[PDB]
Design an enzyme around this catalytic site. Sequence first.
Site, short mmCIF file in Angstrom:
data_model
loop_
_atom_site.label_atom_id
_atom_site.label_comp_id
_atom_site.label_asym_id
_atom_site.label_seq_id
_atom_site.Cartn_x
_atom_site.Cartn_y
_atom_site.Cartn_z
CE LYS A 1 -4.15 4.41 0.42
NZ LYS A 1 -2.66 4.34 0.77
CB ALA B 1 -4.64 -2.56 11.69
N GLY C 1 -2.49 0.84 15.68
CA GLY C 1 -2.63 2.04 16.52
C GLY C 1 -1.96 3.28 15.95
CG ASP D 1 -1.89 1.16 1.26
OD1 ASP D 1 -2.92 1.04 0.60
OD2 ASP D 1 -1.61 2.19 1.94
#
Length: 308
Positions: free
Chosen positions: A79, A207, A209, A45
């Site tokens: 993105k 995920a 934190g 990602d």
Amino acid sequence: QCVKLNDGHFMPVLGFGTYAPPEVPRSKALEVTKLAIEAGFRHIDSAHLYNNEEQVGLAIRSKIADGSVKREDIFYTSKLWSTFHRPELVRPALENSLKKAQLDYVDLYLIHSPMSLKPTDENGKVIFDIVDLCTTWEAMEKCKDAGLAKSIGVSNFNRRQLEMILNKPGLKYKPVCNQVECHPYFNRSKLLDFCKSKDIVLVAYSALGSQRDKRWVDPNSPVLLEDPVLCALAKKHKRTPALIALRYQLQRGVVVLAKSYNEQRIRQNVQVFEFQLTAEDMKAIDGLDRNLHYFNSDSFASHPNYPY
Ligand SMILES: NC(=O)c1ccc[n+]([C@@H]2O[C@H](COP(=O)([O-])OP(=O)(O)OC[C@H]3O[C@@H](n4cnc5c(N)ncnc54)[C@H](OP(=O)(O)O)[C@@H]3O)[C@@H](O)[C@H]2O)c1
Ligand SMILES: COc1ccc2c(c1)c(CC(=O)O)c(C)n2C(=O)c1ccc(Cl)cc1
């Protein structure tokens, strides 16, 4: 190890998070993305905003060239940044990301956030732009039709914002996913139920934190991985609190990202496939939800399209 998306493509359920703060040398993304592929990550990602697509791209290219993986084995996401929501800017932004990464296509292109920005004020609030995101979405669909992105989706959308896309007259492609902040202190159960009802995959970021960036994150916010319930589950399972937090998302049907720039932790995180949590373990984690989005700054909270 994958889930089928609503356009027929497949997304691996564990992804490697590639963002590191500006103080980490650019070269480090090349090293660690190679280590992530070696450890067995296949979903990677990135984003224009992360200023690392050249390095992440080179890591992918390097592991293809050395025989470790083929391009069809890698699922790479980028993105669209929020200053490129006007529809005429979308395909050039994607072409730029493809050029930085030296890829012919991305497997997934996301609208990074619903909060459009002018293509900060004296107050330190972002300077918003008002753009009908359905027009941005039409431009994204044209990117999928051109083959620049195999799949398209969104990020940081709430229910209403997703509905506006889903109900768009003449919609050609639904978003395949909504990548959102999601962890045991902000588990997004209602939004997950909605996404499942529309066959939209919820993808969890922060995920573990989050990186607790000073720009956005209150240092007083309790630290997810020090949570005593997660720590006690880790000891019971002889795993670690990070692996408990990742496993929790998989068992809910959420695809989960994990960032690490540490060689031992990168290798650790793929252990998420090696154990399970029980119903009672899952209920104990569900009890931690406290509506805590770590992203919580004046700079965005008064944007007209803020999703929270
Ligand atoms: N769409 C969006 O708006 C958005 C926003 C935020 C993030 N993201 C994506 O989601 C990715 C993941 O989110 P994130 O960057 O906030 O971080 P995260 O995955 O929540 O991880 C937070 C910290 O956990 C540590 N960590 C990782 N594995 C661990 C382990 N096994 N044990 C102990 N600590 C561990 C990491 O530090 P070390 O590196 O020191 O291991 C990392 O800095 C980002 O990199 C980016 O790709 C997207
Ligand atoms: C924990 O909540 C967030 C939310 C967004 C985040 C981050 C953390 C981090 C840092 C981290 O990952 O910990 C980065 C770099 N974010 C962005 O990419 C981002 C994307 C869209 C907008 Cl509008 C603003 C910022």
